[PDB]
Design an enzyme around this catalytic site. Sequence first.
Site, short mmCIF file in Angstrom:
data_model
loop_
_atom_site.label_atom_id
_atom_site.label_comp_id
_atom_site.label_asym_id
_atom_site.label_seq_id
_atom_site.Cartn_x
_atom_site.Cartn_y
_atom_site.Cartn_z
N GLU A 1 0.85 -1.21 0.00
CA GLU A 1 0.00 0.00 0.00
C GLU A 1 0.88 1.25 0.00
OE1 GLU A 1 -3.02 0.72 -0.50
OE2 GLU A 1 -2.97 2.84 -0.02
N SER B 1 19.80 -6.73 -8.43
CA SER B 1 18.81 -6.91 -9.51
C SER B 1 19.13 -7.86 -10.68
CB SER B 1 18.47 -5.55 -10.14
OG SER B 1 18.03 -4.62 -9.17
N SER C 1 5.40 -7.33 -9.24
CA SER C 1 5.93 -6.23 -8.47
C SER C 1 4.89 -5.14 -8.47
CB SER C 1 7.22 -5.71 -9.10
OG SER C 1 6.95 -5.05 -10.33
C1 LIG Z 1 19.65 -10.10 -16.40
C2 LIG Z 1 18.25 -9.56 -16.07
N1 LIG Z 1 17.35 -9.60 -17.06
C3 LIG Z 1 16.10 -9.15 -16.88
C4 LIG Z 1 15.68 -8.62 -15.65
C5 LIG Z 1 14.24 -8.10 -15.41
N2 LIG Z 1 13.46 -8.98 -14.52
C6 LIG Z 1 13.31 -8.72 -13.17
S1 LIG Z 1 12.35 -9.98 -12.39
C7 LIG Z 1 12.16 -10.82 -13.92
C8 LIG Z 1 11.34 -12.10 -13.81
C9 LIG Z 1 12.18 -13.24 -13.17
O1 LIG Z 1 11.31 -14.37 -13.00
P1 LIG Z 1 11.65 -15.51 -12.02
O2 LIG Z 1 13.13 -15.81 -12.07
O3 LIG Z 1 10.84 -16.68 -12.47
O4 LIG Z 1 11.24 -15.09 -10.56
P2 LIG Z 1 9.85 -14.68 -9.88
O5 LIG Z 1 9.78 -13.19 -10.00
O6 LIG Z 1 8.73 -15.39 -10.53
O7 LIG Z 1 10.01 -15.12 -8.42
C10 LIG Z 1 12.77 -10.23 -14.98
C11 LIG Z 1 12.79 -10.73 -16.44
C12 LIG Z 1 16.71 -8.63 -14.63
N3 LIG Z 1 16.48 -8.15 -13.37
N4 LIG Z 1 17.97 -9.08 -14.82
K LIG Z 2 21.27 -11.24 -8.43
#
Ligand SMILES: Cc1ncc(C[n+]2csc(CCOP(=O)(O)OP(=O)(O)O)c2C)c(N)n1
Ligand SMILES: [K+]
Lengths: 391, 391, 335, 335
Positions: free
Chosen positions: A72, A158, A288
């Site tokens: 929130e 990240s 998110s």
């Molecule tokens: C190298 C890289 N590529 C793309 C991203 C953008 N990104 C952030 S979360 C995400 C989804 C990741 O999915 P998952 O590993 O299945 O985890 P979940 O969020 O489902 O727990 C992506 C593509 C990133 N942070 N780092």
């Molecule tokens: K990481």
Amino acid sequence: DKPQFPGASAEFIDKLEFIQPNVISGIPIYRVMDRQGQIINPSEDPHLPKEKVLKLYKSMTLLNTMDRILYESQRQGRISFYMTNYGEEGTHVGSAAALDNTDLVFGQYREAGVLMYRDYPLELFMAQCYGNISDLGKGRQMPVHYGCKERHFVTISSPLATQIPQAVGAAYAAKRANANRVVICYFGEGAASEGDAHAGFNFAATLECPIIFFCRNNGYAISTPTSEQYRGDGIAARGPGYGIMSIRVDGNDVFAVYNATKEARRRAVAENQPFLIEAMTYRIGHHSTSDDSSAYRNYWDKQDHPISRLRHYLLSQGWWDEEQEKAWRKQSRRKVMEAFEQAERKPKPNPNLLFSDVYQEMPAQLRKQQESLARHLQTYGEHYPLDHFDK
Amino acid sequence: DKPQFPGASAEFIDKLEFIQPNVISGIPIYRVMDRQGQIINPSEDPHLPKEKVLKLYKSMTLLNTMDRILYESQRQGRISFYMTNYGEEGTHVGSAAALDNTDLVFGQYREAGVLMYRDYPLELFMAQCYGNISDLGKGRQMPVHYGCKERHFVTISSPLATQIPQAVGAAYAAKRANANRVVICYFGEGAASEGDAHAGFNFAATLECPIIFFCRNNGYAISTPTSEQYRGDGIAARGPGYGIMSIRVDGNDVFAVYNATKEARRRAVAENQPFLIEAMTYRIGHHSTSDDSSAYRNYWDKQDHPISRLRHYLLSQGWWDEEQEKAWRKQSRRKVMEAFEQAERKPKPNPNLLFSDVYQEMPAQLRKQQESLARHLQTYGEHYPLDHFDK
Amino acid sequence: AHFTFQEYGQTQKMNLFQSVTSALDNSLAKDPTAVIFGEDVAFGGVFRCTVGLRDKYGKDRVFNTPLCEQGIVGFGIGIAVTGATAIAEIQFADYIFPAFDQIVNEAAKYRYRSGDLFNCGSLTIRSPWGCVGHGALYASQSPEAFFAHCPGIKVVIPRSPFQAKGLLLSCIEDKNPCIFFEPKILYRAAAEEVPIEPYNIPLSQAEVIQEGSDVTLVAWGTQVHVIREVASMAKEKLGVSCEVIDLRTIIPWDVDTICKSVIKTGRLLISHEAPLTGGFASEISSTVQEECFLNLEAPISRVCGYDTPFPHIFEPFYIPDKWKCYDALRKMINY
Amino acid sequence: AHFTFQEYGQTQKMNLFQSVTSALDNSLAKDPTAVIFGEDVAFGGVFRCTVGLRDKYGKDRVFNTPLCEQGIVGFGIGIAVTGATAIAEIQFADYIFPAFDQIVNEAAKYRYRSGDLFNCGSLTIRSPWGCVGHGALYASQSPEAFFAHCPGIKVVIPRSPFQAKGLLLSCIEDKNPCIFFEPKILYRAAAEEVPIEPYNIPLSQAEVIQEGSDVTLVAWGTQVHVIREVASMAKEKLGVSCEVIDLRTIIPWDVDTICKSVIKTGRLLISHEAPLTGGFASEISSTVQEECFLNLEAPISRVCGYDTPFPHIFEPFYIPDKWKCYDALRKMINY
Ligand SMILES: Cc1ncc(C[n+]2csc(CCOP(=O)(O)OP(=O)(O)O)c2C)c(N)n1
Ligand SMILES: [K+]
Ligand SMILES: Cc1ncc(C[n+]2csc(CCOP(=O)(O)OP(=O)(O)O)c2C)c(N)n1
Ligand SMILES: [K+]
Ligand SMILES: [K+]
Ligand SMILES: [K+]
Ligand SMILES: [Mn+2]
Ligand SMILES: [Mn+2]
């Protein structure tokens, strides 16, 4: 005749036959209690004492209470970003509970429950999301990029999957130091598609490292379903290809998660060998706060939830009741709101912290940039939010 | 109760059991003829006509003759680098023979036999190693980085495994154009450890591409044995993990290699699905000319060689004799020495070719660098090897 | 040969590869946590830099990894995170790019982003670097500028066996992730006296190897030998006094030493094998222009490789040799 | 808000993300081979740049790939090698590094090394770029300088919706692998009239958006809006006439236009969000110094991000805002 090739150990075959992947009937899912909290096989019951099972329940619900509040907050623009743990609270506490307190943890961003179970203060979770003076991270990273040296939880970053081969190196160093220590590394099924996952799994097996790879397979990587992420039998099926002992568990069953983790830690440390645990779960909330999950897709929140399932378990044991549920809900909320208000009222760190820790020492050319800013603010200070930052 | 998780299709299991990798007893090795050239199972005999089997034999031995000559040349500093194909001649011709002439090929550097089978001129193999005026590559890359647009053989580059996901994109484009075309991608077992291999295998399966992955497992990546490269059951065992149809073949048996490749091309094109062929072989010669393989390690050259084995096969059919062997050996040598001498005598390309093709057009700032050099040579030309380069 | 090569206790004649082995040997000898790993280092490495080390220190300290550069760096960062010393080898600098993400997004920012709760300061990455006469596109690269734009890491390049061993021991002991580039062309050419026991050469310090008063010449690696000869040519043919400086550390670089030199000479020529556009000479040039505007008598000169990939057969025409540097110096001296 | 935003047939009001969708739409409409792919582009992309395209052109042309950047670029190079148009998306410029090897060692050198027998010219890589107020370390980066040192690729950055669509259509149609960086902070802020049909803006051409006579100000992306305001401040408070230039193409860059401008004004200030050391302003600065030495009246000024990773809570003090650029301009005007 016997095959002599150095690359493999096998017998000759005289008929041409392609090896077919088993996907329709994949690696089975290990479960300990049903969706109504009943133990299915007495011989798999962990028999965890009451205090520990309650700690599991309270850590999950407490995380949940914090998630609602911080979500929130983000909606109101009080914090700039946030990611909840809905539906995955069980994989966090169940695996953390199975570890030794000093086992080093590497994670992705949806593992705050490991810290919660490790008694990380509510004040610190929030200090980091607000980037206030109490954040040991000094307000440098985006919200939910938690880290704690004291609780052996390596700071979250990240870039997906980078922590995987890092965790392997950490486990290798652990092996040499001869500590009775295992390293655990969490990541999602999407992250498992990065080149770094392949690197980590392979180095772990060939270099014989005491590490537990923990994949949370929740069906989606933001908007991408698993049908577009891989075509094999999930992540679990890739482990044996690297010569890695693997297993799949029901991620909404804290006891199945706990049993698998406990047994993998035990063997990983003794045999200096990696283990792969794939926990099947479902991402309840949005990816998110910058995502509206209802653009690419209630069964998992009302009929197969880790918190709900542990609740039924507690009831059957006479360990929890509706009244206790109410009191805990109220106390949880109070604890979270106290930390939240203290967090919003603290000032942000001194702008000088923008220059330290780039290198251990501060290079002369970097200090000159720091002085530059200090002079700039002497003169144009009225145009910057100086009143909100510490001095 | 039935598992509902989106990430996998499986049943629940009630007892904790880790999946164990099968390494001692790996994926069997497909073989068609024994080490004495005898067909083992009549129903697996390809029954290739005589002319084609002779073309296979002559391409292998011709490659071998060229390798000996170019290897010595390198020893004398006539060319700056070289890599032979000893022991892997069978994987090249057997797989190439199974392809359609227009199937696009991506390779690593130990696949010259694919070009040889595709009638690439001896004059061009050598033009590239000498970087002379006849090299369509314009003398820009190191020796043995061959490429031919006319024979659909994508130019070889040094960075390991980069061609793998590239090959997948090429196959995807092929699928859309609806050509009856498959793409084939070669790489060693060492290269299979790079992040790009994992990327290519996974994109190939999830994006349903008509591609054949062809891994030559020769036991070593320079000085590293396979025991330090991976711990699973070789490369073949990783295919099913990606949902990829896989098979292992005896790389010293051109017929087993041919049968596996022929069947994978057929299905890859019709089903728009990837196939993985792992050919077990043994690296007979040094890794390259900058390596002395007898620092980290005769059975494979005298008792299990692809050329030797096809020879016995030809004898049993009455298709080859000691006399023909002698005449072919002499003619091979002559053909190779003719191309070799013509290659050494040609001048190198015009130094201006150092600036073209960086971009399609030549940027103005790049042309100014070209003019810079031209002026520099006007004045200090006596200090550069100008007489050896074309004008 | 496009170039010509030229206190601490007992010394011994060592070429560059031998001085690296000596440095690695002293480190493992004095640091029980230190390990060395990468592709092919067990049998001694493709350039012989690790010969004998595995037999002397054990297979758990000197070992081969699977063929995966992003893995090698990630693995190294992990070891460093626990505080152990990690010396990773990347076989050719040309193949460091697959690990670029681990270097720029992870290693360099590890301490900053965590508020110093964690770090990978005990990590060192060593890699052969520079042209070798016939390496073409992927056995000749000089990638230092790609890393110069990355706050958080150090990039160090030696010009000789004595300099290499001292600079490498500082990299290995520095509390920041370091990249050490070894000019592969010198591995077996450059041979000189080298202390057999450990010593250090400080990072971020350039070295004036020859004082002068008319021009300042700056380079690093093998290229320092080229400008040394160019300085000699300038003297013999133009009566020009050259001040020859070895930068040694790419970042953080010794700004002071270079400026102090240019304030005196008033003229500057920077030279490097890497391509001109975006090469590190740009950073040095624009900075000097900002600190020595009033002293500069002529435009700063950059003699670099052309803006093209590194060629095989055309190498002799590509590199910024002594004649090219001399000519630019000549024209600049006449501005 | 650290900045303030401000012939071809029928136009339509479009913000930056909409103008990208319009460009991608025109391309697929006129190029049957063209495909768009990357992480999450099917449902329209995390910044809405691909909304509606899959429904209009089909799932075989607009699709999601597995989460692997090195794979996305390698896959794209493959498609381009057959001659088909490949438009790959990297979700954040911060995550382009894992594909660095495929970009620098492969894409950029593809045509050169093969003697033009093969190429991947029909490849375009688009990626969100720049700060967004709270993106911290991995959602704020400006990696253009890392790529400026790589012969073989083009790097292009627009400042608005009209500029974006025309520059992207040229990137997509250029016969060289291109990287197109989209200032994510403008995706929804910047809104202006944009031709609904296709048009092109040429690559390697800077644009003088405001003529002046006392100083030349150069920037790109969002930063062009900052110097535009700084120019206004200079006029109002110093009576100074500023010549404001948008570089637009990082490499190959428009050297001529910048020099011609500095020959007239005699003063130059270059500004960019990326860190100072090794940033592209260095290349521009050292080059101008070499072409306009005699016209330069004061040292060239570079107002950039500090040499640290991009911070979360300290963003306001990190960026080279209008007050920072103004102050440097002031001091330079007074040299
Ligand atoms: C190298 C890289 N590529 C793309 C991203 C953008 N990104 C952030 S979360 C995400 C989804 C990741 O999915 P998952 O590993 O299945 O985890 P979940 O969020 O489902 O727990 C992506 C593509 C990133 N942070 N780092
Ligand atoms: K990481
Ligand atoms: C990314 C990259 N890393 C390292 C090298 C150096 N290298 C060249 S060949 C080689 C061995 C590769 O072994 P393998 O793939 O098994 O093929 P083989 O030579 O046995 O046919 C290595 C490590 C390279 N060219 N590219
Ligand atoms: K390659
Ligand atoms: K270090
Ligand atoms: K293009
Ligand atoms: Mn997921
Ligand atoms: Mn091999």
